[PDB]
Symmetry: C5
């Protein structure tokens, strides 16, 4: 499920809660115009996970990637807090939700 | 169970021992006002895992996150040493306790 | 499968999409003339995964390696975006594609 | 079992060889007075794994932690080279020894 | 199996190809005179994996460690490119070779 804190923190922003998503792809891309981490759901929706060059976004972005990678590789659900102001939508928070 | 060392180290602080917690969620959040790592128990309690910018808190905080992530992903218990001076409570030490 | 985003981002470059590859080897080599990460398919084709010294190529190249390592160790498929301008061909994007 | 090299290197120091230990706990602690990584065996012995701020102790200490973490999480044995000059004893070398 | 590229790159150096080795130990040692990462085969042979302080040897040596660690923990074979000019012999390249 989704933690109350996760839902409440997402509700304090312009981003949308996406609940119990099954990710089936994660990619890393070093191409000039498309650099970044993308994740895709079984339905084919794609999100972008922004990177962080400085503390604390550096280690926090790294944990977002580890959560997404584990979700794809172990086939376990996540909750996303995602901004629809971009295409693909940007992940601003992610929660591992295996049960 | 809880190592005697873990219990004794927690007793030397203002933080409370939480024994045999089953974590079911871990999240990473880069939103401006809620930046951080959160973990949630099957009962729905949430804790915050502080970051560390400098040695040795940088590598120690990283190991706390690896313990929490493994606990969620593998569904294994932890012991927490948690400060109630914050909401959510802050984790100041964590022990992986699979058996 | 291949995410539409992965296919479309690869089509915007001179690199070719390689779909549902089964990687059976990954190597790391510190020899003077051959330094780098190589990955090999069950058919015996080899690709090179370039490194990155600076942000953001440093963390992105690290994620490309984690995807390739998981693909080999867990025997799960990937999609590659690979440049044929080099021998072995260079991976410019990789997508973990378990199902 | 224990590699001959591991045994011989430990014998060249003041530290004691501990063979085929089953680790059942690992913790990370950022409390002011008890900062560090601790591991505990099924028999109830506890060790401290020192950190390293500079090359090469930084990456070597990180590998010691990965070995201990995997030993706990996977329930597989290690060999330790531990100094009794401190309580808890300090780990100066660790060997993953699954079989 | 051994990738043709892995074999050919090793043949361009003074190092020897060691094929389908089963590693049963990996150790990290911070002792003054024996600092380093060692791996040992089921036959009892030991190799040393050199570290790297600077780009690109830093990330490449880290990937060699991850390959060796996975080989030990998951009991899967590797290929080594190893120099006999040292005792223990130095690993200059390693290939994960599960099947
Ligand atoms: C109205 C309006 O547009 N309000 C905006 C606000 O506009 C101000 C600016 O345009 C400045 C330029 O200086 O002018 C101000 O007016 C000034 C005038 O220029 C001065 O010269 C002088 O006369 O004084 C006046 C008054 O000060 C305008 O007031 O600008 C702010 C800052 O961008 C906007 O704040 C955002 O508001 C939205 C909802 O309205 C959200 O609260 C957003 O926060 C979040 C989000 O939820 O989207 C939080 C979220 O955690 C965060 N995500 C991450 C990953 O950190 C995102 C993210 O940072 C952004 O969405 C990315 O763009 O933002 C507020 O930041 C305000 O809406
Ligand atoms: C006749 C002779 O000694 N030739 C060696 C050469 O001598 C130089 C003189 O000709 C010059 O006038 O005076 C200089 C002194 O100021 C020199 O003495 O020196 C070169 C560079 O040292 C030697 O090159 C080495 O040659 C080896 C085989 O002949 C071998 O090719 C070495 O390359 C490798 C290797 O295969 O062993 C390439 C490996 O990828 C590399 N491994 C790593 C991890 O990078 C190793 C490694 O760097 C060395 O083994 C470490 O000692 O080197 C090559 O560099 C030349 O033989």
């Amino acid at each position: 499920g989704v933690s109350k804190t996760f839902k409440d923190k997402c509700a304090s922003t312009t981003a949308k809660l996406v609940q119990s998503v099954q990710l089936v792809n994660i990619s890393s891309d070093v191409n000039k115009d498309s650099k970044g981490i993308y994740i895709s759901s079984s339905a084919g929706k794609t999100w972008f996970i922004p990177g962080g060059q400085y503390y604390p976004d550096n280690y926090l972005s790294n944990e977002m990637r580890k959560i997404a990678m584990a979700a794809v590789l172990s086939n376990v659900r996540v909750n996303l807090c995602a901004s629809e102001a971009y295409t693909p939508n940007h992940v601003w928070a992610i929660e591992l939700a295996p049960h």
